[PDB]
Design a protein around this ligand. Structure first.
Ligand SMILES: Nc1nc2c(ncn2[C@H]2C[C@H](O)[C@@H](COP(=O)(O)OP(=O)(O)CP(=O)(O)O)O2)c(=O)[nH]1
Ligand SMILES: [Cl-]
Ligand SMILES: [Cl-]
Ligand SMILES: [Cl-]
Ligand SMILES: [Cl-]
Ligand SMILES: [Cl-]
Ligand SMILES: [Mg+2]
Ligand code: NA
Ligand code: NA
Ligand code: NA
Length: 326
DNA sequence: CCGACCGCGCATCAGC
DNA sequence: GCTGATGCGC
DNA sequence: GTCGG
């Protein structure tokens, strides 16, 4: 919040480039700058001071001067007044509707929450659930509620097979007092990078969760990735809790650390760390860390027995989850 | 300059 | 049916 | 939009 004005501005510019301009790199450029400045322990007094941080170049430096001077940015004021941009931005807030779909809907006159509702026939399954819970997915989840959700999931998973290990990751694992959703890493001895000794490993869990009415909907589902909706049970006479987004990722047991590193994030932190890995000659995904051969082709998985082993490989001092919130 | 910008699962489409 | 490109998301 | 070679 120290530099909240500036970071909000950069985020708005990032989302604009992503949703309207469909310019992913400009999007990521603004995000990075926002991230670097959010972490900066001083109240920025000028663009120049900001340019000193990696990620802030000449352009963002100017915008920061304009912002610090007037408390606003013309580029944004104009964008806010543009109907197409505003429409596209709004629609992209529905889960399942990205930049393309949003622009197409607008081409059909479907630009508001009202238009989306009377045109359900024009939405795929995911987008349909996104609209249904449009308001709920906008609410944050207090950590207290994340703890109740954690307890349900672990206990339910345990009932299916005592050997399943479910680990809540994402911002929750990073210690956040509130999370946008719940992220669950799931492992089972029958599933290793070596073999899948038992089928329906993810299915059984999803099934058990739906049975106790925890999982309410399904956006998408595969052998290793589940993307849906869940809701805590409410007591007698009390207003029921909001529906929450939930992701469940089944990863080979023997590749847990690369998996938990990945799911703990943050997303930006992962991008920076993977980028750094490359510079050091490695490549990192959710399954392994491999060296980059002379020809650039990835080599064989390197042995890993902790998240720290991954950090060491790329010559980075270990960073506890709570400090990976970039 | 100017090329790189992390890496991957699922849903959906077009071409065969 | 399949493979691959594209959208969307984590 | 920013950066490093
Ligand atoms: N390499 C990558 N990894 C990624 C990426 N997007 C997401 N992720 C990883 C890291 C996230 O923590 C994790 C969960 O995804 P989530 O969106 O839930 O992020 P949280 O950190 O939990 C913030 P919250 O608002 O939900 O509290 O998935 C990506 O582009 N590239
Ligand atoms: Cl771009
Ligand atoms: Cl503004
Ligand atoms: Cl691992
Ligand atoms: Cl791999
Ligand atoms: Cl921590
Ligand atoms: Mg999350
Ligand atoms: Na800079
Ligand atoms: Na969306
Ligand atoms: Na998530």
């Amino acid at each position: 919040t120290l530099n909240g004005g500036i970071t909000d501005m950069l985020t708005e510019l990032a989302n604009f480039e992503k949703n309207v301009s469909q310019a992913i790199h400009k999007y990521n450029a603004y995000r990075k700058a926002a991230s670097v400045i959010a972490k900066y322990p001083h109240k920025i007094k000028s663009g120049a001071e900001a340019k000193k941080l990696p990620g802030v170049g000449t352009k963002i430096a100017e915008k920061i001067d304009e912002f610090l001077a007037t408390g606003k940015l013309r580029k944004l004021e104009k964008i806010r007044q543009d109907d197409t941009s505003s429409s596209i931005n709004f629609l992209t807030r529905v889960s399942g509707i990205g930049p393309s779909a949003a622009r197409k809907f607008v081409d059909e006159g479907i630009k508001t929450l009202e238009d989306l509702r009377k045109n359900e026939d024009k939405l795929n399954h995911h987008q349909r659930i996104g609209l249904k819970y449009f308001g709920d997915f906008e609410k944050r989840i207090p950590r207290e509620e994340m703890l109740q959700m954690q307890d349900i999931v672990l206990n339910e998973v345990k009932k299916v097979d005592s050997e399943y290990i479910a680990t809540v990751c994402g911002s929750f694992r990073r210690g956040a007092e509130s999370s946008g959703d719940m992220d669950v890493l799931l492992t089972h001895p029958s599933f290793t990078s070596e073999s899948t000794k038992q089928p329906k490993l993810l299915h059984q869990v999803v099934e058990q969760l739906q049975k106790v009415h925890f999982i309410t909907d399904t956006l998408s589902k595969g052998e290793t990735k589940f993307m849906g909706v869940c809701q805590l049970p409410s007591k007698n006479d009390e207003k029921e809790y909001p529906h929450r987004r939930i992701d469940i990722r089944l990863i080979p047991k023997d590749q847990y650390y690369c998996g938990v590193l990945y799911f703990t994030g943050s997303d930006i932190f992962n991008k920076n760390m993977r980028a750094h890995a490359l510079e050091k000659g490695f490549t990192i995904n959710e399954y392994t860390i491999r060296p980059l051969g002379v020809t650039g082709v990835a080599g064989e998985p390197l042995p890993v027995d902790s998240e720290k082993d991954i950090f060491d490989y790329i010559q980075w001092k270990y960073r506890e989850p709570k400090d990976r919130s970039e």
